[PDB]
Symmetry: D2
Subunit: 416 residues, 4 copies
């Protein structure tokens, strides 16, 4: 009722500036967010859960209740899912495989992910994938796909090749292509002599990894740059330019992670440049706090900036929105909830923007009006629209979702 | 009525989280925003209006309609003010003096600002002040208060001392202390051999500058650090530590400017630290875009963080909120309008935060709850309260204010 | 003799670590540095010299004696050149053409550069070139090649196409391909609604611009990204990713400018990545001080890192090294001299590095030894080798060159 | 002989510029470097060596041969020391205490460091100290001195109070005041509501901590700011402005750590500013690679700028020079060796600078000459001077020191 009313006023407000709230809602329904599985168990995986997170990535917090297997994970995920409106996907790491016996990374098969697949069907989720190139003895030296050792190198190439197959299976089975992201930790902590060679090896390996042609309808390859990681601060083989080059040249999708750049550097600006040259873009929304810290996505300037770009450019088909963060210092379900909802809220507000009007003002050099209007947009009643969206999707419109979280914690997590 | 309706709903939603919108509105009225006069004529001043803006500060845009004198300036200020709700002050620079004949800077008098004073009275505005230590032949070497030349030095000293008197005069007349900010461009463009001497001169100069005791009820001294300027990139005499030591040791107020720090550096963090050692703070809100660009303040992450800090700590008395930006690329009046409204919006929002609750959660280590709630606060109907605030002050609640600016521009600005 | 002695000692020291100083000297002779002409007259050019430097690029200092025509510029250049050992090139801007009557930018011709060419021949200098897309009426809106106006856009397109021909002309005549760099200021000061369209337009334009096939032996196209400029802080059409994609996909050269990235971002790291995708690199060495301030190049960490990368990779052929800075606050000749020699000193040091050994240690995981060695390199007697370099090229080995500059200043610059 | 010869040449060259190399050598011996003990055992300490390094501080590498006790530590220190020329000191942490039985941190005594002292006596070293406020159950919440719980708070206060007594004990016994630095990890990983209260508590605590007047001839109190740490990214109680204010207000010494600031921020600039307010400076030399990474100090731009400042200002008495870094990815002895020598190399180069002349050029506005000379200074034969310094101190002049380290590694480290 209050919502209802609030909704009506909003409807009218927006109408007056040429904005159709309904349509906005429809459109928001066309923008799924792929939730990252790893937020649930601290990137532990099911290969060897308790066995140090590596790659220059880190888990800070030790809050209790982490999931410890597929089952807990799925349960945790559903809980989160019920408190997040609209479309979602699940982004999986190869270490999240389910097998009675241990599987060599270079040997995974679709079969190791059937449960995930059946579950996804049941939950009306699309699935995404990622070879796991870290937290492994063969990753110990800080090199994987660029490793100078042929054999090591081969093992990683093989794992990647296999991963493409699982991914393709996901798309076959789900009817929506699985975006399979390649991220590797390869780099050097200190002053490096030869930055080239590794880059050369990485180039060759990737080409081999994507050599097998797969159905685009079921599978997409993406490469993700990174500036630096803890323990590999001075050099990253797979740098921004390297992958920009790579994706452009081999026509794979390019993954842009909001926490993987320089200080003050923003992927929102990159979206429009990159799409002129690469087929698709996988966007990893994450909050870096003075480093690639992986904090939870907030409804902030850059998250909003990113949404705007996607929406202004009508990137519904070519962009894949994913979360990329891991905060172990708080409730993990809450983490996914806050994150996802935030992304959606940024999206919605972008959908509520009178872009054409603004675009038109800009074209005319009416900078005064553009700024002004861009700013006014912030005090328009979008919240009302967001809450109607929640309501429609049977999701708590406000802070009440916290009680559910609290409740599940008490009831479940508390026992883990 | 829609407003009224929206207001009522909000009133209720907030109340449900323990927030009283009516009190909020009242509190907002206790937070004036000191608008910088220099935004109206591109820091031209009236001494010698057309005569290059110096000091490492720039004016970009050349948009038409700039004020050309006190009269235009006041008119322009008036338009702006009618479009901005609640309390405001006028922050004046010494070069805005009004004299039939030329006045040496080191000789200005209270009488050179009587009109400004009268006007202020009439408009119920408090006045703040600043000595002008740039765009002057004796500032051309890039040194003023720290100039090795005793005589040049003296001159600036004197100008400063005289400015304290003008400021005190304002306080006396207006019944509200004038905060007199001291900013100098002093620094070097390139690799510097001696960073010490200039700082030594600066320190001594300052002490001299403030040696005359004035009524604290009418006048406050503030000092403003700065990281770098165009043309003085390598070193700034009046650095952050410099003024922090100064203000702490001499007990003056400290001026913190949102555009005068390192990349990713934020004054919002600094507020709670500095208030433990300095009597008062002068806050310069500004948006630096890649440098001390002086862009209009937006309702953004930092402007909000700033507001929150002031409000959380109940800094009503010890904080002086001011704007410090200059964008000549768009309508000047709009520039002021957007920025002032934005500051006020941020403050309002801070006033609507359930801090005590939050504070309590944080103290108990409930970081899940704190984050979640901080975030949910962004989808609370604050805009309705803001709009009511506008209404109550007879100010447009939405974008309509542009029309006004537009019309003033046609009728007025168009003829300049 | 002292030099001789020091040299001999050095010769032996280096020999002992497997380094041949003689060979390094020879190598150094294979690495010209392209001097930027614009440092001589404050990017004034000869179209309309006194007529505001625009493009978000600035000239700070106002030191006296700037060159006022091609004659003075050449004289100044020669003086500089006699103080810089080894190979050099001259990098010209379109606005430095020499014509009795005005020439529309869109109609320049080889013939407008004949004297530069004859001079170059006589001075044994290769020539480089650049279209001048700024400081012009049709660049006044901040857009050139991405301008939405078809005709303006065409104009800049034409001007670039015409510049290619001048460029080829240089390569024909001099027998060394002229690298023709493309840099445009296009961007926005403030928050932008559409970053895509301008990139789209830029993309198409460049394509048209390079459509004419010219002889590689005489001509090379290069594109240069930029992060931001004064008066275009928020967005730059031709971003890093933009050109990275561009160069990669159209196989043009990619220009990496040391002052054009984010804080802490270094192109030295980008060299080995870009060369895997682009056929050539044009490197602009510059010292950005908190902004693309264009300070003189120092023998500093980053200039050395760039040097090392080129040398380590044996990029003698694919890399074009040039200067890109402008300091008008000191003697301009000295500016050139300092920067040029510094780049050469950085090169020589790189050439005196026992790379193989190091490379070898790194590949074995001997990071201890690597770090140790790299650092000890710094206290080896490279100064001696540099000084002998100077001597063999009949150039002052030390600070004495300043006398020369001072002398020219007195005799010539003093009367400008 | 070759050294002697190079030495003589250098001698002459520097004299020609008014620099006396013998005097330099002498002044260099007046500038000890305080080696941090913790690099040798990865901050393990002796309370509970194997028991996770906390505080937002990390140890990356796991290279073998870390010291396991005081004995190992001392032996390792000695090996390092024989490879580092001229004066050094040892900086101790409270966790390196030697006791048969466990000692609550709140009750340590001078007697728990007796061996250290006797060893220092025998090795002619001065000693520095630090309370350890991390890697402890009572520091698990991320708060220590700012902890809201009175008792926890009380424990850390007492620990600091007792550490002061140990420190004074060092001063007494050694005849040189021990500088006792106070660093705590206290901060928040995420968005914080109340930054004020912890600061107020910290303030009050520090005042209590230093309430006991000790003999300045034996002891000095220093406070160390920090910007952020892993797991405490968002807020740090003891910020730059907090400690600048504190040190200025209580007249303690101020610790500036080169890895503890914002990107591009440098302490070299801060020295001259701070010195005007605080009695003494504690300077931590460290290399932050994209974060407070704690990499080994290189002879780099900033290390050199710090040295230059100390020396230019004749800060021999008021500044205490120490190392603050921890790299566990390479041989720990070498880490110390590299960093220490690098710091000494930078100081020596500063000592060889013709400051007065340069100062004099600068004061006259001869910026051309200043830059030119500053830069020419880099090609002067400082290496020979350094190498003589090494020889006079019975230390390897070059890279040969690695063989000693390698040898120790084989004989001793290999068996740990
Ligand atoms: C676990 C995850 O794939 C990882 O974070 C990568 O995506 C990359 O962002 C690393 O910093
Ligand atoms: C004109 C005005 O005082 C000025 O901008 C200062 O406050 C400081 O920001 C200067 O760069
Ligand atoms: C004038 C000169 O070409 C210019 O500097 C561009 O190349 C680019 O560096 C912009 O600053
Ligand atoms: C362990 C050591 O004291 C520590 O490094 C502190 O001094 C501070 O620099 C934190 O990073
Ligand atoms: Mn990440
Ligand atoms: Mn400013
Ligand atoms: Mn530049
Ligand atoms: Mn540190
Ligand atoms: Zn990612
Ligand atoms: Zn300011
Ligand atoms: Zn350039
Ligand atoms: Zn430190």
């Amino acid at each position: 009722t209050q919502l209802e009313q609030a909704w009506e006023l909003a409807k009218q407000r927006f109408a007056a500036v040429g904005i159709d709230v309904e349509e906005a809602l429809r459109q928001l329904d066309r923008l799924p967010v792929s939730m990252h599985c790893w937020q649930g168990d601290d990137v532990s995986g099911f290969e060897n859960p308790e066995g140090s997170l590596t790659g220059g990535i880190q888990a800070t917090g030790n809050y209790p209740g982490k999931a410890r297997n597929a089952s807990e994970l799925r349960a945790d995920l559903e809980q989160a899912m019920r408190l997040i409106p609209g479309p979602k996907r699940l982004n999986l790491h190869a270490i999240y495989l389910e097998s009675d016996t241990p599987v060599s990374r270079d040997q995974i098969k679709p079969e190791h992910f059937k449960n995930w697949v059946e579950w996804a069907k049941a939950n009306q989720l699309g699935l995404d994938f990622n070879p796991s190139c870290f937290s492994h003895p063969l990753s110990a030296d800080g090199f994987t796909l660029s490793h100078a050792d042929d054999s090591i190198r081969q093992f990683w190439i093989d794992h990647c090749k296999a991963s493409r197959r699982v991914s393709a299976y996901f798309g076959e089975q789900l009817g929506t292509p699985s975006v399979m992201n390649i991220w590797i930790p390869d780099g050097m902590k200190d002053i490096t002599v030869d930055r080239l060679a590794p880059r050369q090896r990485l180039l060759a390996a990737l080409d081999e990894v994507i050599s097998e042609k797969l159905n685009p309808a079921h599978h997409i390859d993406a490469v993700e740059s990174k500036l630096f990681g803890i323990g590999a601060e001075s050099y990253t083989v797979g740098s921004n330019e390297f992958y920009m080059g790579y994706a452009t040249s081999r026509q794979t999708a390019l993954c842009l992670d909001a926490g993987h750049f320089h200080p003050t550097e923003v992927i929102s600006d990159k979206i429009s440049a990159a799409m002129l040259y690469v087929p698709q873009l996988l966007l990893h929304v994450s909050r870096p706090v003075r480093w690639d810290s992986d904090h939870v996505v907030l409804l902030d300037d850059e998250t909003q900036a990113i949404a705007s770009e996607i929406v202004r450019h009508d990137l519904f088909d070519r962009v894949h929105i994913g979360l990329d963060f891991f905060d172990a210092s708080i409730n993990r379900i809450a983490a996914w909830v806050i994150g996802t909802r935030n992304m959606k809220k940024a999206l919605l507000r972008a959908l509520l923007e009178p872009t054409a009007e603004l675009r038109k003002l800009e074209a005319p050099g009416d900078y005064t009006a553009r700024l002004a209007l861009l700013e006014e947009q912030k005090s328009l009643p979008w919240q009302a629209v967001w809450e109607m969206y929640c309501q429609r999707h049977d999701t708590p419109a406000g802070s009440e979702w916290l009680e559910s979280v609290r409740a599940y914690e008490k009831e479940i997590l508390s026992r883990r």
